[PDB]
From Swiss-Prot, chain B:
Cellular-component GO terms for this entry: cytoplasm; nucleolus; preribosome, large subunit precursor; ribosome
Keywords: Cytoplasm, Nucleus, Ribonucleoprotein, Ribosomal protein
Identification of the protein by name: Large ribosomal subunit protein uL10
Biological processes, Gene Ontology terms: nuclear-transcribed mRNA catabolic process; ribosomal large subunit assembly; rRNA processing
GO terms assigned for molecular function: RNA binding
Secretion signal, residue range per the UniProt entry: none
Matching InterPro entries: Mrt4, Ribosomal_uL10, Ribosomal_uL10-like_insert, Ribosomal_uL10-like_insert_sf, Ribosomal_uL10-like_sf, Ribosome_Assembly_uL10
Disulfide linkage: none
Species this chain originates from: Chaetomium thermophilum (strain DSM 1495 / CBS 144.50 / IMI 039719)
Location of this chain's protein in the cell: Nucleus, Nucleolus; Cytoplasm
Superkingdom assignment: Eukaryota
Function: Component of the ribosome assembly machinery. Nuclear paralog of the ribosomal protein P0, it binds pre-60S subunits at an early stage of assembly in the nucleolus, and is replaced by P0 in cytoplasmic pre-60S subunits and mature 80S ribosomes.
Swiss-Prot record, chain D:
Family: Belongs to the TRAFAC class OBG-HflX-like GTPase superfamily. OBG GTPase family. NOG subfamily.
Residues that hold GTP according to the record: 62-69, 87-91, 108-110
Subcellular localization: Nucleus, Nucleolus
Record's protein name: Nucleolar GTP-binding protein 1
Gene designation per UniProt: NOG1
Binding site for Mg(2+): 69, 89
Function field: Involved in the biogenesis of the 60S ribosomal subunit.
Length: 222, 245, 62, 110, 54, 190, 70
RNA sequence: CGCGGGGUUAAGGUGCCGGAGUGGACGCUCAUCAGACACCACAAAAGGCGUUAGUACAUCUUGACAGCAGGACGGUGGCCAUGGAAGUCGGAAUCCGCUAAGGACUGUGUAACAACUCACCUGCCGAAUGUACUAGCCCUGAAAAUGGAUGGCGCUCAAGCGU
RNA sequence: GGGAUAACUGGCUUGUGGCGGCCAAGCGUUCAUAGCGACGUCGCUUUUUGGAUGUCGGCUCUUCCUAUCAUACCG
């Protein structure tokens, strides 16, 4: 077998003597097979089959109406690519937990179970907030900001946290709950303000539940 | 309720013609009645109708119509009370089956002579009577099945091999060559597709069509003709022989 | 490995039984029965030809 | 893993696992086309003739229709289409022969 | 499937009073929630064609 | 909708003897006798004209009239079997190992036995017992072809399927290995 | 005789499945044809008149609103 | 709500255990663990070629759907591209004649052809259909680990469901 | 120091992310626009050259489930 030997063998000998007939018969039996599958399967498999069949019906109806209308009748990618290419060209051209452990060595601990934002790498907090530990992984540095106009969504760095309506204590710490307005750098977006002027930092409302879904999503306020 | 055929939608441009097409046919026949003088009525009982296009191209001068017999007959006017011109009711009662109309401006005798001289070979339709015991040799099956001499005959295709096997030939495609029996020959006996006097069925007719064997004669039988001035129809030969209602 | 109760093995065993061990066991039992026979030959009511009575949880007591 | 390690509720773990598996699902969904391309290249690289460049080899070349395929069928036991049209063979074909107890590999080029 | 020869664990139809009570309370809560949403807030078909004397 | 009445008609030719005692349709013809019990369905049989049998349902459902249609077809097939009989021209193909087929009348039970050897070189001999009433012959007109002739369509078709199923390839590429015994022609004796 | 899609040739020419057969007469069916067509037409002018009146009322209301705004 | 005799009822029941109807009328449903009387989540504009009723539209002797016998052409191997691409590997346009109808074409197929087949159209037959939805009953719509539950037996023109 | 909850789940659990837009049958305050609204697609995560884990365990034995590693069977 050097090259496309099955079609060479079909050219030299042909197929089975029964292939066309039984292929037609299977194509005909397909409907009864589908009905039996719909009426007999059970346990996650009927669920997968039902979702697949519902989808397939959706595209089938879409195709039917598309052909009907055509027979009767006789920039977000660009913006994202520009921002990403600018970033690529620009590129081309101790922890609080161990600190608190050392303090303890030298229920008294409360650890915040909600995502937060710090900013500066190392900070020694005033004693009023010293014992509010925040874990390593739960912070998020950048947020997915969706711009209501121009219909573009871009990942932009988080500047700071301004107001968490759930708790002023969460606000002061930097807890990122649902609907929480933070300050976001929008230099990459390049929106032009009055006097033909550009803006760098703007309000964005975190609108998801980051504890439910780690990815942090905000809608920009313009 | 349930348990019904899955209707296969046709993802293709061409659609039903319908009521608009039928009223177009009324309009065409009714408007083409006045200009011409001799409205011939003819029959093509059991012949393939490819060569109607050629006879159209030949008698470019005339105008020919062929649809639903009922549709054309009533467009003419079956009842004499609702009739475009006298005698057209007679033409309608002539119109029964595989029947076409022929508006002409010229000599009926010349029309009759030309249509008598018209004669083409054709592949047989289903239901006819076979005149020959045509068969294929036990050796290699060729393009026409041995009608032309094998030395000047190209072999038939492995693409057509499955169709021949489906339609009944005990043929086998060995070493890329399609053969009834053995590649060298002999071994088997042979396959006679149809016999003398046998009523050809759809299977045998498809066999002759695949092997390019013609055993039918395309000819048009003029039932009659109606003159505009006289307003009467004169039947000739096929007119009286062919049953009509 | 195919199970001892596999259908294919059962069919092969039946074929072996009917085709191989059959005649051998037949001839064996033939000579055995022959030697058995060698060793073995080595009024109606008053005579007992008519079978009579010798010498109830099915029906309810009456 | 860190998010689940710091998870605090059953619904927390619910939505975290759902979100992660969604991320992998979307990643493969974007990977849809490379899988098709790599499947096709796998199929051909499987149905690719295997020659030995080092061993004794004889290549047959020229214009099409000269008779290269006929020569290779004559000299070795390899099936090469001998159909008489311009580019009959679209791929390299390989046969082998013995010559005083020695192996040679013959290659037919298109 | 081989359910015919080897039946599985049966699904009991003998409802427990605790389950019945929970369903009753939750359904009552559903009715109250529907009422609350309704209070919060934010075409005649015609004579049938097949009627003989339309 | 509970249809009040429905009927179907079956014409019989001039040379048969049909009898339905309770529901045992027994048809007698030149080649032999075919008997089938139809006790599993509710039908009323009558002779509606000189040579047409009317099978009817009264106060039945759509499933019942469907049963009427299918039993009509089965009775028609029995008529066709006793008038003309059925023939199945069977073909076998091989690539390098010629298949050997031998048909023998096992006198006890009076039945054909067909043995197949050298099917893709397996030393196993595939022996298939043949349906009662149908006859098998090795065709002499064509090569590597058998003929299965009989009266009962169900019997002859089931036997042909049994042959085509016993000659089945295992764990091999069907695209390359084309050996087997296949149905070629299905028709009437006459 | 033509050919059938399956290899079966012995199958007789079957009639269309028709349990509701011979219940109505065609000519009567045609009178019902005409009556149904006329009823549909009547529905059409009734609906058209009602919709036209409603549209005229809506236009009058809009004109009154414009006059009030002015 | 004292102790007794007799009578009649409520809730609930009248196949047996259980005292009382295998009571009557019209229909629906066959579940590879149906359902069983006063309740819902799984659940969704969810899949069902199960079954019945119904609604709105469309064709119909001017012959409706399905089927069988056929035709399925001409400019033309349409324009760009290229080993070669002719309706059918690729981008765009997608027109006209003949028409009864035939798309610069729905698939099969060729190295390209060829050829088959599709759309559509005529001949044969002859009477309802066929598209989408609403409503009932039924299947699935998710399940682990000792053997058990409409209370049990069991029930299928019910001993299930609606009045 | 006072107050409050004695405590958790029990037809709960699994395989398919979230945010925003487009589309969207239906329903809706009076009508697909007060508005709700599935499947898909688009933008972000996400792209042009290939270690996490604290107390525990360790062994054996019985039984059971399958959401099956192997044996058997086929598409």
């Amino acid at each position: 077998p050097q090259n496309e030997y099955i079609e060479r063998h079909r050219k030299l000998h042909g197929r089975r003597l029964d292939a066309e007939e039984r292929a037609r018969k299977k194509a005909a039996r397909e409907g009864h097979k589908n009905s039996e599958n719909a009426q007999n399967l059970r346990g996650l498999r009927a669920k997968l089959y039902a979702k697949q069949r519902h989808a397939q019906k959706i595209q089938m109806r879409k195709a039917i109406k598309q052909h009907e209308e055509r027979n009767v009748k006789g920039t977000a990618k660009a913006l994202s690519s520009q921002i990403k290419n600018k970033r690529a060209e620009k590129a081309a051209r101790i922890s609080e937990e161990e600190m608190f452990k050392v303090v303890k060595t030298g229920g008294w601990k409360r650890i915040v179970t909600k995502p937060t934002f710090v900013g500066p790498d190392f900070t020694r907090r005033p004693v009023k907030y010293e014992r509010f530990i925040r874990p390593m992984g739960l912070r998020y540095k950048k947020a997915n900001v969706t711009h209501p106009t121009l219909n573009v969504t871009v990942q932009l760095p988080i500047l700071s946290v301004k107001k968490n309506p759930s708790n002023p204590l969460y606000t002061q710490l930097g807890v990122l709950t649902k609907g929480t307005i933070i300050e976001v750098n929008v230099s990459d977006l390049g929106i032009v303000t009055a006097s033909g002027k550009i803006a760098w930092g703007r309000y964005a409302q975190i609108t998801n539940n980051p504890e439910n879904d780690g990815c942090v999503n905000a809608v920009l306020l313009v | 309720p349930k348990s019904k055929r899955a209707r296969v939608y046709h993802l293709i441009q061409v659609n039903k013609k319908g009521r608009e097409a039928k009223e177009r046919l009324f309009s065409n026949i009714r408007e083409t009645i006045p200009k011409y003088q001799h409205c011939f009525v003819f029959s093509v009982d059991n012949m393939r109708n490819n060569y109607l296009k050629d006879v159209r191209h030949e008698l470019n001068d005339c105008r020919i119509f062929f649809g639903k017999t009922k549709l054309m007959a009533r467009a003419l006017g079956t009842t004499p009370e609702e009739e475009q011109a006298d005698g057209l009711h007679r033409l309608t009662r002539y119109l029964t089956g595989t029947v076409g109309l022929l508006f002409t401006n010229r000599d009926p005798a010349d029309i009759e002579s030309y249509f008598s001289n018209l004669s083409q070979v054709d592949f047989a339709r289903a239901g006819t009577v076979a005149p020959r015991t045509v068969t294929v040799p036990t050796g290699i099956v060729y393009s026409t099945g041995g009608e032309v001499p094998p030395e000047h005959d190209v072999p038939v295709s492995h693409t057509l091999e499955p169709e021949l096997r489906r339609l009944g030939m005990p043929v086998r495609m060995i070493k890329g060559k399609v053969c009834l029996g053995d590649e060298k020959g002999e071994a088997s006996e042979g396959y006679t597709i149809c016999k003398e006097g046998e009523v050809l069925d759809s299977r045998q007719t498809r066999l002759l069509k695949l092997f390019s064997i013609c055993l039918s004669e395309f000819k048009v039988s003029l039932l009659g003709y109606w003159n505009s001035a006289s307003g009467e129809v004169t039947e000739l030969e096929a007119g009286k022989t062919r049953p009509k209602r | 490995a195919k199970s001892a109760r596999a259908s294919r093995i059962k069919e092969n065993h039946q074929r072996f039984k009917k085709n191989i061990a059959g005649p051998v066991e037949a001839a064996r039992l033939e000579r055995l029965s022959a030697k058995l026979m060698a060793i073995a030959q080595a009024s109606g009511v008053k005579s007992g030809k008519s079978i009579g009575r010798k010498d109830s949880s099915i029906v309810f007591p009456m | 893993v860190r998010l689940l390690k710091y998870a605090q509720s059953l619904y927390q773990c619910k939505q975290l696992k759902r979100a992660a598996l969604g991320r992998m699902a979307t990643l493969i969904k974007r990977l849809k086309d490379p899988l098709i391309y790599l499947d096709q290249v796998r199929q051909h690289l499987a149905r690719l003739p295997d020659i030995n460049p080092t061993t004794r080899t004889l290549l047959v070349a020229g214009f099409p229709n000269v008779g290269k395929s006929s020569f290779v069928r004559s000299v070795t036991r390899a099936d090469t289409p001998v159909e008489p049209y311009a580019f009959t063979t679209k791929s390299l074909f390989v046969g082998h022969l013995d010559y005083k107890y020695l192996r040679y590999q013959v290659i037919d080029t298109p | 499937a081989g359910t015919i020869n080897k039946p599985k664990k049966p699904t009991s139809k003998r409802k427990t009073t605790r389950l019945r009570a929970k369903i009753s309370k939750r359904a009552a809560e559903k009715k109250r929630k529907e009422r609350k949403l309704a209070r919060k807030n934010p075409k005649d078909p015609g004579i049938p064609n097949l009627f003989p004397y339309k | 909708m509970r249809y009040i009445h429905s009927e179907e008609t079956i014409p019989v030719p001039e040379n048969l003897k049909v009898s339905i005692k309770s529901r045992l349709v027994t048809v007698e013809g030149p080649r032999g006798k075919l008997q089938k019990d139809l006790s599993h369905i509710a039908v009323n049989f009558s002779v509606v004209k000189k040579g047409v049998i009317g099978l009817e349902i009264h106060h039945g459902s759509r499933k019942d009239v469907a049963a009427l249609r299918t039993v009509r077809t089965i009775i028609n097939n029995m008529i066709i079997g006793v008038t003309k009989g059925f023939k199945y021209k069977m073909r076998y193909v091989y690539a390098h190992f010629p298949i050997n087929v031998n048909v023998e009348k096992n006198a006890e039970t009076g039945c054909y036995e067909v043995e197949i050897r050298n099917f893709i070189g397996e030393k196993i001999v595939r022996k298939v017992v043949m349906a009662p009433g149908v006859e098998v012959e090795i065709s002499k007109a064509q090569k590597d072809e058998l003929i299965l002739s009989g009266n009962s369509l169900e019997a002859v078709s089931q036997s042909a399927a049994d042959i085509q199923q016993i000659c089945k390839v295992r764990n091999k590429d069907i695209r390359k290995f084309l050996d087997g015994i296949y149905v070629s022609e299905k028709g009437n004796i006459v | 005789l033509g050919m059938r899609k399956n290899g079966q040739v012995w199958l007789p020419a079957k009639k269309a499945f028709r349990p509701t057969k011979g219940l109505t007469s065609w000519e009567l069916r045609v009178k019902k044809r005409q009556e149904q067509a006329a009823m549909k037409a009547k529905e059409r002018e009734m609906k058209e008149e009602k919709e036209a009146e409603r549209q005229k009322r809506i236009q009058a209301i809009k004109e009154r609103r414009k006059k009030k705004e002015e």
